[PDB]
Amino acid sequence: IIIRYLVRETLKSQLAILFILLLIFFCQKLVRILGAAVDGDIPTNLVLSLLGLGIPEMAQLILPLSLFLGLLMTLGKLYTESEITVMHACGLSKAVLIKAAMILALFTGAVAAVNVMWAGPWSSRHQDEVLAEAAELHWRFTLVATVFIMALMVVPLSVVNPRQGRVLSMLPAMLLYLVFFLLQTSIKSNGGKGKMDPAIWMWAINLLYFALAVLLNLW
Amino acid sequence: VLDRYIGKTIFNTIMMTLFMLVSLSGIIKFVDQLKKSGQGSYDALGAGLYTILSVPKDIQIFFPMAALLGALLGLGMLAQRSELVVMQASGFTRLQVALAVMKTAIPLVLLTMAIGEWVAPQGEQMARNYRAPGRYQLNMWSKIFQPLSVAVMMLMALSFIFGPLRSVPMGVRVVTGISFGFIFYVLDQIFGPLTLVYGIPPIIGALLPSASFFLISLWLMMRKA
Amino acid sequence: MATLTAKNLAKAYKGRRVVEDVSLTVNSGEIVGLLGPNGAGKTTTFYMVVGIVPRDAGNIIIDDEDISLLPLHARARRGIGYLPQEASIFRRLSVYDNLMAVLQIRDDLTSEQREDRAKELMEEFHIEHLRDSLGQALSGGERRRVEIARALAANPKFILLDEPFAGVDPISVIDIKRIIEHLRDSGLGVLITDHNVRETLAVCERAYIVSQGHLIAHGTPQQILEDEQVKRVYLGE
Amino acid sequence: ATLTAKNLAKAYKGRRVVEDVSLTVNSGEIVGLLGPNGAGKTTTFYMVVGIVPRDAGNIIIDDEDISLLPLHARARRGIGYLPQEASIFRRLSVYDNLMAVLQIRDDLTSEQREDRAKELMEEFHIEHLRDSLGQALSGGERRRVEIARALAANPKFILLDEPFAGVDPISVIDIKRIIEHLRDSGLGVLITDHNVRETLAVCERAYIVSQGHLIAHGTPQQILEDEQVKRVYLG
Numbered sequence A: 001i002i003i004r005y006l007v008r009e010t011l012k013s014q015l016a017i018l019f020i021l022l023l024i025f026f027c028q029k030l031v032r033i034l035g036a037a038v039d040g041d042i043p044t045n046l047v048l049s050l051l052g053l054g055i056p057e058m059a060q061l062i063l064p065l066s067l068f069l070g071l072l073m074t075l076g077k078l079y080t081e082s083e084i085t086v087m088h089a090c091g092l093s094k095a096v097l098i099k100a101a102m103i104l105a106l107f108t109g110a111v112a113a114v115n116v117m118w119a120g121p122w123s124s125r126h127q128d129e130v131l132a133e134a135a136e137l138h139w140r141f142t143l144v145a146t147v148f149i150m151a152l153m154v155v156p157l158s159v160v161n162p163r164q165g166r167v168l169s170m171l172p173a174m175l176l177y178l179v180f181f182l183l184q185t186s187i188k189s190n191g192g193k194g195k196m197d198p199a200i201w202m203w204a205i206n207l208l209y210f211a212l213a214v215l216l217n218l219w
Numbered sequence B: 001v002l003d004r005y006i007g008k009t010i011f012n013t014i015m016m017t018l019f020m021l022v023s024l025s026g027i028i029k030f031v032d033q034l035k036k037s038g039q040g041s042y043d044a045l046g047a048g049l050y051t052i053l054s055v056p057k058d059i060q061i062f063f064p065m066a067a068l069l070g071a072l073l074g075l076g077m078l079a080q081r082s083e084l085v086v087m088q089a090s091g092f093t094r095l096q097v098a099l100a101v102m103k104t105a106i107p108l109v110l111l112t113m114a115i116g117e118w119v120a121p122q123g124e125q126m127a128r129n130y131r132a133p134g135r136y137q138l139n140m141w142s143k144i145f146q147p148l149s150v151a152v153m154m155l156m157a158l159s160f161i162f163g164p165l166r167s168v169p170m171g172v173r174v175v176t177g178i179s180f181g182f183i184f185y186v187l188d189q190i191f192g193p194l195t196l197v198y199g200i201p202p203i204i205g206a207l208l209p210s211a212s213f214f215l216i217s218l219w220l221m222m223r224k225a
Numbered sequence C: 001m002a003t004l005t006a007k008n009l010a011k012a013y014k015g016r017r018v019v020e021d022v023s024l025t026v027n028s029g030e031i032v033g034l035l036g037p038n039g040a041g042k043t044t045t046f047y048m049v050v051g052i053v054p055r056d057a058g059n060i061i062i063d064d065e066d067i068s069l070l071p072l073h074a075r076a077r078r079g080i081g082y083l084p085q086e087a088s089i090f091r092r093l094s095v096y097d098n099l100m101a102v103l104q105i106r107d108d109l110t111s112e113q114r115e116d117r118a119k120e121l122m123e124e125f126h127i128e129h130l131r132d133s134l135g136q137a138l139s140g141g142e143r144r145r146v147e148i149a150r151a152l153a154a155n156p157k158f159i160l161l162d163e164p165f166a167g168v169d170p171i172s173v174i175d176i177k178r179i180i181e182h183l184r185d186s187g188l189g190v191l192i193t194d195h196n197v198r199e200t201l202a203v204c205e206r207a208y209i210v211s212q213g214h215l216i217a218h219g220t221p222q223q224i225l226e227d228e229q230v231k232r233v234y235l236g237e
Numbered sequence D: 001a002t003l004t005a006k007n008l009a010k011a012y013k014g015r016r017v018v019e020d021v022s023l024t025v026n027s028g029e030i031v032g033l034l035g036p037n038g039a040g041k042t043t044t045f046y047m048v049v050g051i052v053p054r055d056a057g058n059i060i061i062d063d064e065d066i067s068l069l070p071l072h073a074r075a076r077r078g079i080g081y082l083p084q085e086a087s088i089f090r091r092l093s094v095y096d097n098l099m100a101v102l103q104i105r106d107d108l109t110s111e112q113r114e115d116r117a118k119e120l121m122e123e124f125h126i127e128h129l130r131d132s133l134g135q136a137l138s139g140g141e142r143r144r145v146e147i148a149r150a151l152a153a154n155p156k157f158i159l160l161d162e163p164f165a166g167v168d169p170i171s172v173i174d175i176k177r178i179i180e181h182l183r184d185s186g187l188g189v190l191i192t193d194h195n196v197r198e199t200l201a202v203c204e205r206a207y208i209v210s211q212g213h214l215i216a217h218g219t220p221q222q223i224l225e226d227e228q229v230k231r232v233y234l235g
Ligand SMILES: CCCCCCCCCCCCCC(=O)O[C@H](CCCCCCCCCCC)CC(=O)O[C@@H]1[C@@H](NC(=O)C[C@@H](CCCCCCCCCCC)OC(=O)CCCCCCCCCCC)[C@H](OC[C@H]2O[C@H](OP(=O)(O)O)[C@H](NC(=O)C[C@H](O)CCCCCCCCCCC)[C@@H](OC(=O)C[C@H](O)CCCCCCCCCCC)[C@@H]2O)O[C@H](CO[C@]2(C(=O)O)C[C@@H](O[C@]3(C(=O)O)C[C@@H](O)[C@@H](O)[C@@H]([C@H](O)CO)O3)[C@@H](O[C@H]3O[C@H]([C@@H](O)CO)[C@@H](OP(=O)(O)O)[C@H](O[C@H]4O[C@H]([C@@H](O)CO[C@H]5O[C@H]([C@@H](O)CO)[C@@H](O)[C@H](O)[C@@H]5O)[C@@H](OP(=O)(O)O)[C@H](O)[C@@H]4O)[C@@H]3O)[C@@H]([C@H](O)CO)O2)[C@H]1OP(=O)(O)O
Pocket: A021, A024, A025, A028, A029, A032, A061, A065, A069, A174, A175, A177, A178, A181, A182, A185, A192, A193, B021, B024, B025, B026, B028, B029, B032, B035, B036, B057, B061, B062, B065, B066, B069, B177, B178, B179, B181, B182, B185
């Protein structure tokens, strides 16, 4: 199928953005680590380990954003080549973009689940000791549901703007993505560690985007 | 006149880019204040904290990172509309464009140093009062080298707009500005604190790798001539 | 046999009347150009015949069935084939994969004939030697053999070519006309919107010229040159 | 006044996209650089202008070497290049736009420079656009500002990069008329347009380049007598 090609191009592109986003998030986590290194006088022996121990922490933020940035760049470049506009002109439907995303978002989601189901707790427990000594679930669960939403959300946000701007198409998709993430990050504030849970607005905002994702996709 | 037009293009792009990026910096950290809200007030953080919250983020961080992204998006926006090539094909010297854009950094370092000596430490220190050596030395000398960094970020844009422009799409230049403008970021908060780790003396090194962009802008200026 | 009938088509961008009532009809075995000053009526009226840019007013009828509302999700599925001016060829895919890719979306074909037709379609335009040749490895001269061959692999009527003469090499102009003859010989309408005037009329039996947002001309190229309204605004001798 | 080239050749990364091409244009002699696209037609043209640096050839105006010289140094002497894109100085008015370029000519005094600006504004019938922002101008208007701007630097030879790019054939008379004024003055045109059927009707002689090396040199009348284009280009 062409869908297999759509994924193979995206996966070859997401796997490149993933390295690029890993480096970008490496520096941010290294800056925070280095800042804590000079503030708390944390020894240099394990600063590298902490960088390699916060990877699941960054993974929650990049794995959706690596697929999304991959989807935006791939669909950006495919539309910049005027390939998508023929992909619909040849009898395929916009569902092909969606089904291509989902059949590749199930992968990223499954990996996102692994960074949520196992690597998350795995990261923190190793992060607690680092040989130095010598609720969340509503945010935890919405991370997987983010991938399916954004893969559904990116496919309408990249094919109407590139008529005039190569990167100006990404901005509304990125800003609408950013308004999702910070608001989702903002809401996961009240009732954190422990059994106390945040009020019912985190999934209310998250479900809002899914409705907003379907709303502009059906055109 | 042709240099003055370069000034508005390059300077207006730098100023607008700085403003949009500063809005992003504000609300991304504003929601951080919403996270810390409940001490007494968040609407007050919206009004009183926000104004003195915005100005500091420019000088130590978002000004030079948006300075490169200002010209490399702007001075490449002229080459995006083939303005630069006609500007050069009319005989405006290639060494005069660098004498044009960098001459518009003199009004831009004053809008940085004076916004980094009278309101960046006066406002930010006032901003945290609204929420009621190994470290300083490195930073302080670096903050004196702040005019040189925006003059080099602006000098990096000249090489990136006269070297690797290769009829690129504006988008590519943006991510070049996003990336080297982020490389300049990581090289300002990783290499700067690493200075004490490797024992690089301030009297000789410190934030010079951040200003070693010059040596990254000097192998990007004669490489193809 | 089949007819692509576009009538009453009009749309205003930002409120400015880009195109007014245009009545253009093309049947199978007819090649109609969509020409005129750039920006006047072309690149906006033509696309709405295809369906890319949404239509504000008008009605499109093919096979005695209206398609004006439906985008390429169903407009391309029924009877409309669009080929863009740029490199729509699937860059990161092979020719025996991209041909079938749009050949296998249409459910109205047995899989045994599905694999067969791609072999029969690939040989039609002399692409047999370019079998699994990966895309992006083809010149602009062959970019079209596969680009048209792909857009032909949907059983589409009235194949609307969008500026076929973009990479204008006057030996490519001769080649492109030849493959368009096959599309006309394929019992399909053709709708061209090429920039240049002097070469499209050499292959078009009819030509709907739209200027000032209002369709102005239609019919034989010989009929076109004797009309004053088109000549004083498009050619001027 | 001449703009001659000697055995020009260049490879982007070793492909030899141009092989021993020589172009000679004398003042008042409109010349066209026609042939297959991407085959060397643009690269040879862009090598003359200065966008693509010279590799193994040599370009000469009269006796002065301009091979190593970049575009502007070549431009400051006698070269005026017109890009395919707009380059209308969107955020600058036409009065300022011409006077901005006129400042490059250092030998011209400011008092006489203003008269030169007015001379060109009334020469291309764009004088009423002195107050216009210049952000948006018609295809007839847009090119006239660019040509006035290029003509303001007072070059010896002006090179149009596809002046007939995406233009309606009724304005081809206007674009050619702009070219006609350039040849009316002591200027040397160099058109690089792909529409060979429209460019060739203006040029005295043309150099048509293919697959790296120029194959046809002379008047378009002589080109039709050349068997390469009559058998491999037309048929
Ligand atoms: C185009 C392609 C796209 C590219 C890719 C995109 C890139 C994205 C990059 C992101 C990477 C990182 C990801 C991330 O970042 O991820 C998360 C981010 C998510 C989104 C990211 C991804 C985006 C979407 C995807 C992308 C889509 C496009 C955030 C995070 O992570 O969330 C939080 C984080 N936010 C961010 O980071 C924002 C994020 C924002 C990200 C922005 C992304 C922008 C992308 C733009 C895209 C453009 C297109 C649209 O990133 C930053 O900005 C960093 C800079 C990034 C820039 C990178 C470059 C970008 C380039 C882009 C182009 C290439 C925040 O602090 C970070 C700030 O730092 C600097 O400011 P400052 O300098 O500090 O001011 C920065 N300044 C800067 O950087 C500098 C500049 O400004 C910026 C420069 C940037 C570059 C500039 C140039 C750029 C290039 C330009 C080129 C063009 C700020 O910048 C800002 O402001 C924001 C800034 O303007 C904006 C950024 C600018 C970006 C601009 C980009 C422009 C690009 C344009 C072109 C593209 C920044 O916000 O807080 C936490 C960390 O702090 C922690 C830690 O964990 O380390 C926790 C602390 O607790 C705090 C807290 O701070 O929260 C503080 C406390 O005082 C208190 O207040 C407490 C509560 O409030 C109380 O009520 O909270 C404390 O812990 C412990 O400390 C003590 C311990 O030691 C013991 O003693 C204890 O006691 P105590 O001593 O008392 O404290 C504590 O216990 C307290 O609490 C207990 C209870 O609560 C119990 O609860 C328990 O459990 C809880 C857990 O369950 C929770 O989970 C926890 O609470 C605890 O565990 C707790 O124990 C009490 O117990 P009880 O008593 O009650 O019982 C107890 O008594 C006590 O009270 C606790 O235990 C301590 C440490 O642990 C000590 O050990 O520090 C984080 O939580 P966490 O990390 O998750 O944990």
